[PDB]
Design a binder for this molecule. Structure first.
Ligand SMILES: CO[C@H]1O[C@H](CO)[C@@H](O)[C@H](O)[C@@H]1O
Ligand SMILES: CO[C@H]1O[C@H](CO)[C@@H](O)[C@H](O)[C@@H]1O
Ligand SMILES: CO[C@H]1O[C@H](CO)[C@@H](O)[C@H](O)[C@@H]1O
Ligand SMILES: CO[C@H]1O[C@H](CO)[C@@H](O)[C@H](O)[C@@H]1O
Ligand SMILES: CO[C@H]1O[C@H](CO)[C@@H](O)[C@H](O)[C@@H]1O
Ligand SMILES: CO[C@H]1O[C@H](CO)[C@@H](O)[C@H](O)[C@@H]1O
Lengths: 144, 144, 144, 144
């Protein structure tokens, strides 16, 4: 893994989930959300084969699918973390900004913001902590 | 440059300043600060030679020097951006967290926070926008 | 470009030809050969898009096409360089070894051998020097 | 490890020896040689600390030390492999070419040649197979 791994943003509960591969391209995100981020699932390419990571998190909220077109890639991710109900600190919102459009915000932008603008590099995968919801979130980047 | 380049955090004024090299190790930071971040200067290693980047920014505030010991490296950077006086959006504070201790916060933690926790990788250099102060800030990371 | 670039193997004549991109996957090679290597052409993926490099070299010899399957990647390249006719030093043969099978040798294995076994990494593109034939050859590798 | 790992050149006997670290700079090589390569030892830098790898191999031949100056780095390695005595295939010679001078050849340039010219990158460490002599040899490279 010649990847830079950033994270975690969020809290300490739930369970750590992570990839088992060497991603070079992010092709798809399925995110479940409502008052916070419920779940994440994403597809990546490795040696020309597509692998499905996740679903990580629960089946609450509503689903949205982001299918990146060829030539489309993320240039920034933003989000917010904070309390929800009985959970002290989880991922309340996520926004995915590509070179073509913005996806989100998903969830609700309450709590402490974070932001990852990418001047040079490619976002290729994610990891985090998960229970019924997304407790924490992190990012894998490849040099460009 | 097989480096991941993150940024910019902050505003659009001042002037872009950036490295001209291939850093593999951050050895020293000199930061000037008071109500905000006034200036940045740092030393990096390339092919076993030490290079001095900066000073970028003005000569206001007070100076603090961070000299990393062998075996010491940054595991996270935090900061805040926002208005100062007549400047709409600049870097108000920066905190540098190594595997041994925390340096800062420098400046004042007013405005919008940002945070870059590094789970795998090495911070080796910086860039930004600079006038009399630090208008904007960014980070270079190497896979570990 | 966070790629390791190896080369050149071969001579100093012909004209340098090189990629203008950030390849992350080699999908196809078209090689022209007979007594030496006449030409190279290859396709690579960047941000999910396929780009064609070449053809570099002349229209002599006979053509062979290598189409990598999903999950197939090169683990080694071998070849030979040396004199042919009026050319002091050019690429006489190339062999491409994937995790599934061996392609080649192409050309004739006369002259000085070279070999690039890859223990960890991915070969994603090539460059070289070219006239009527392949004067010289080089390889781009990505960490895996 | 965001390093490209090339190898092995040589035979299948002796015992595999390898680094346990994340090198970013090669500072020193100690090589034992005569009719073949008897042993390798090298120092590398990681997070500003110097670690010694080896000695790998036996105590035959004569010793030579290569101490790289600040700003000096390897641009190519050459060698030869082949039979010697009862050993079917081992490393007969090695030559180390820096941007300032050539070190070697060490050993005897008999057998099958190999060569690793580096157009873009840095050689930061080695591995191999070792018994009384250097059975096999490999190289770690970092993008530059
Ligand atoms: C409802 O509790 C569960 O879900 C939350 C949010 O995912 C976690 O913090 C917690 O550990 C449990 O797994
Ligand atoms: C005081 O004005 C100068 O300094 C500030 C902060 O650096 C910049 O925003 C501005 O463009 C000028 O260079
Ligand atoms: C000897 O001639 C053959 O081999 C050379 C080099 O491969 C080709 O250029 C040529 O067209 C023929 O096919
Ligand atoms: C025949 O002459 C041309 O082709 C050969 C082989 O490619 C080159 O060496 C040379 O510079 C010319 O381009
Ligand atoms: C032929 O003997 C010499 O060369 C071999 C291989 O290099 C060494 O092991 C040995 O000690 C001698 O110096
Ligand atoms: C002499 O026998 C030993 O040394 C040689 C050369 O290193 C190896 O091939 C072999 O496996 C043994 O370790």
């Amino acid at each position: 893994s010649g990847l830079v791994k950033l994270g975690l943003w969020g809290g300490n509960e739930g369970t750590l989930q992570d990839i088992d591969g060497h991603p070079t391209r992010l092709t798809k995100i399925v995110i479940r959300s409502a008052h916070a981020i419920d779940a994440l699932q994403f597809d990546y390419v490795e040696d020309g084969k597509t692998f499905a990571a996740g679903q990580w998190g629960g089946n609450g909220g509503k689903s949205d699918t982001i299918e990146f077109q060829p030539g489309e890639y993320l240039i920034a991710i933003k989000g917010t973390t904070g309390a929800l109900g009985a959970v002290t600190n989880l991922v309340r919102s996520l926004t995915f900004i590509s070179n073509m459009r913005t996806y989100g915000p998903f969830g609700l932008e309450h709590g402490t913001p974070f932001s990852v603008p990418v001047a040079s590099g490619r976002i290729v995968a994610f990891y985090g902590r998960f229970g019924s919801l997304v407790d924490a979130f992190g990012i894998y980047l490849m040099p460009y």
